Amino acid sequence: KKDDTRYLVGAVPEVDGKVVFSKEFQIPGMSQAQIYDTMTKWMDERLKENKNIDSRIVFSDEAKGTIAGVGEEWIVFSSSALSLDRTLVNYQITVTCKPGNCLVELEKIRFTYRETEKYKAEEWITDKYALNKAKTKLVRGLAKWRRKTVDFADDMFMDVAVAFGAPDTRP
Structure with a gap:
């Protein structure tokens, strides 16, 4: 019933054996400094929205156009009248700015579930563990x-x- 096309081959990228989600952005008219200033303001506001002390920018190098922050949030799986199934997630956001372009990486992802269960993304959501042998379905x-x-x-x-x-298409 569920259309899981999005979550199959290539949905969870690995770089040097670690889970790293990434997206490149082409902003050709902007200088490195303009991109860096847009990204520091974005990351600052995005991490402030987490409303916790474990969410903040921790590194920025203006000349190299690099920014890194750490975040902590709840990811909700489902909810019913009685129960609420969610996990804590901790992660790092790494942004690399160059003239006309930006790379955004989401890495060092780890889950804290029901307070004491700790799961590293590399041993949990990678194809090896989370896709069937044929890579046609998610491991239930x-x-x-x-x-x-x-x-x-x-x-x-x-x-x-x-x-x-970009216009925001999210509902």
Whole structure:
């Protein structure tokens, strides 16, 4: 019934054995300094929206146009009258600005579930664990983890596109 096309081959990229979601943005008219200033304001406001002390910009190098922040949020899987199924997620946002372009990476993703269960994205949502052998379906027990993390990354990349002037299509 569920259309899981988005979550199959290539949905969870790996770089040097680690999960890294990424998106490149082409903003050809903007200088490195203009992109860097847009991205520091965006990341500052985006992490302030998490409303916790574990969400903040922790690094910025203006000449190299690099910015990094850490974040902590709840990811909700489902909710019913009685129950609320959610996980904590901790992550790093890494932004690299160059003249006319921006790379946004979401990395170092780890989950804290029901206070004591700790899961690294690399041993949890990667193809190896979360796709069947043929890569046609999500492993049913891991599907909520892979779908909601991919949606979370897509949401972030849309947020960045909107910061660069794209119309927001989200409902």
